[model samples]
Target: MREWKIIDSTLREGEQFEKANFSTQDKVEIAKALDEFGIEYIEVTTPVASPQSRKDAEVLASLGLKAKVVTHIQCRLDAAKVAVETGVQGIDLLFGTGRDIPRIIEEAKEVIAYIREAAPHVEVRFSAEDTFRSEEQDLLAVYEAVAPYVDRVGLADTVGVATPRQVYALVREVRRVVGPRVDIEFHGHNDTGCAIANAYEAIEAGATHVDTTILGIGERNGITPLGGFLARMYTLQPEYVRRKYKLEMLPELDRMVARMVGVEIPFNNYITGETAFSHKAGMHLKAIYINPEAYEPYPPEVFGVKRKLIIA
Candidate 1:
């Protein structure tokens, strides 16, 4: 059996999108909802970013959240120290150490060394920003250098340029170099329209964690949405992953956040969108009505989602 874990980054990374503000109370409420959803980890943001972030982390921790709370930080000593001060359980420390022209390799090396000195107690995560475009060997060297000091290595598809095959190859390479002792996380962007597929491939290649946003609310074309990834996982391993989140809760969750942020969910958005499960074509509708398997992969009811029969 291949067991997998869900790490929800909606509170942290998801908030980065425009107008997606959550008050302290909102944060607590959402955190509670996420705990009920049965995720393994909840990523909280750095307190330095806002007072509410710190308060949310503290409240969620005191509540004895079922999920471990992690805060994000740049690969800087001071940043890591400030993140630790929030009193969260883990730190998602990111640094760009690659051969890119804008980010010199030497600077990347220095950042990794700095994070090692500042937050040794927390589970340190090293991220090579834009790993999809960087040379595989160079990125591997960076991971190898920081492997001993960090607890996990992460690959970020900042531009979302990777395909499934690329994700598989990169994750395998990193795992081979870092070995089984360290955890590997795949943080992908959905710009190139391969976020979900890339994530699945990364897991197949030994990635243990994946970063996801609620309703795919993120910068650019947005990142991988939670529902899409969950659906894919369910299809791949229905019995292995158990989630308390009702697929029905998705529509409400999406609407609630979208209303607060003043952004409307696209009609074509997956799972929670207006047209996600709509059947319009006569043939498609007939097939779906007669036997959902004929037109759809699986009935949306399994995830608490539903199909809409629409003529127009």
Candidate 2:
């Protein structure tokens, strides 16, 4: 996998979770924390969603954190107007399924064009929702048509039904259509437990960005999680992953989101979970005592966590 940036959606997609009810102040706290943790991009909910959302979007954009603040909205000119008014640095547009490919492309292009004309400095992305279930030919046509008009094109496993191989193939195909100029982003749901694996494959197949939420919170089982995804990348490129993010702050990030959402960080959760670093087996503990790396994937200290050994 090449260089891939994370578009942390803890504020956007994460809000869709059933238990998530983030107040304006809570959103600010989370955004600031994420910035400190070195997230490249922080995506917020659509301003068009409500008056409070618009106000919050403006406030978050004005905060001027190191991370670029952006909003996700439907591919509509009206929504684009509200998004640009909120002063976000980027706008991610989602185009839903439509029978008429040509009409859909033209309408989407209109929105992209309006955003460019209104806010030339803002980045624009066109994403096809439920991408895995879409017709390959139709999806390609839409992506190819809109690739030139936007900075990035996203492939969303909205239903979470895509397998790893399918993700790899589709990502590769999208890369070919969009060429090297446009960035490819992957957003996968965890309904079928393929979000993490599919996101990894998307990168292996040439995706440039992946969407992640703290603790993987979202509509259903959530999308790719920030902690788990980083853990996966660390094994392959430890230096780059460590250098790019404040890895040690990861546990706090998970903890903060867990409290806000009113859920316990599952014992089996990626890095920060209770049993993530727990070793109980006698043989396993023996090796772990001699060399923690013997059983640990990455050092717990690297993430500001300690290992637990349940020895008799």
Candidate 3:
């Protein structure tokens, strides 16, 4: 199994959905739930977004969970200071403005330089949102130019308008330009229902990190779902995933967020969906009764779930 980092953005990007609203208490519960579900990293919105956003960052950072709590902020010293005050272990700042080759570079440099001087221990990430829409040459130029300043560089498929092959090619291009100096991260949307696929390809091509939200909750159609991505990864390396994460806890994890946001787990949802593990084909059912693994790629018992026989 390839080494990859999963950055849960339910608290951050999930809140971006118009229907999403989290009281301070709701925030902490989600954070704790995510950590208990075995996520290694959790990214929260910028501290300056609102009074609550900053306080939520402070509150979660103080929880002392094993997962690395991170806060996102703009590329400025003042914003970074507030984020730093929250005590988050990592910081993700963005070049959210237009692609000003020179303008964005200067901002990113100053931000990274200040963080380096002020809080050398904090991890810094530089993200250029909407990477797929930006000119390929210009995007690579910006990422390569900032390669020396940050610990990781992020490529965002802002509108969820990219194909799997396109994402793979772009990530591979970024990997080549950035070399081994910094890690590559991908944050794709699901407007076209390809966020999970694109994210998988990004990792396959060399992206070391991915951003996923609970139930794929976010603005528009949202980003990739935590369970869906895990299912995809698990299918590729079951033992590694089972050993690395609390796979069985996925049901509770999805159920927690779904209930919070007023959504139901889709019948096609992996692992926990009612019909996800069901089989009706006579040949497969016969084979499963003899040896389940013969027909099922995802085992339900591993996640405290059940398999069903769907006969039509």
User: Which candidate tops TM-score?
Assistant: 2
RMSD of 1: 3.3
Model 2, position 206, has a per-residue lDDT of: 96
CA deviation > 4 Å runs, candidate 2: none
Candidate lDDT (C-alpha), each: 0.75, 0.93, 0.87
Q: Mark the regions of model 1 whose C-alpha exceeds 4 Å error after superposition.
A: 97-121, 243-248
**C-alpha displacement of 6 in model 3, angstroms?**
0.5
> Which candidate has the highest lDDT of all?
2
Write candidate 2's Cα lDDT for 92-173 as tens digits: 9998764698988889999998988989999999998899889999899999999999999999998889999999999999
Model 1 pairs whose backbones collide: 247-303, 248-304
Q: Write the per-residue lDDT of candidate 3 for residues 250-283, one digit (tens) a residue.
A: 8888888888888888879867777888899989
Evaluate model 2: give its lDDT: 0.93
| Candidate 2 residue 284 C-alpha distance from true site, Å | 1.0
Error of 2 at 256 (Å): 0.9
Count of backbone clashes, every candidate in sequence: 2, 0, 0
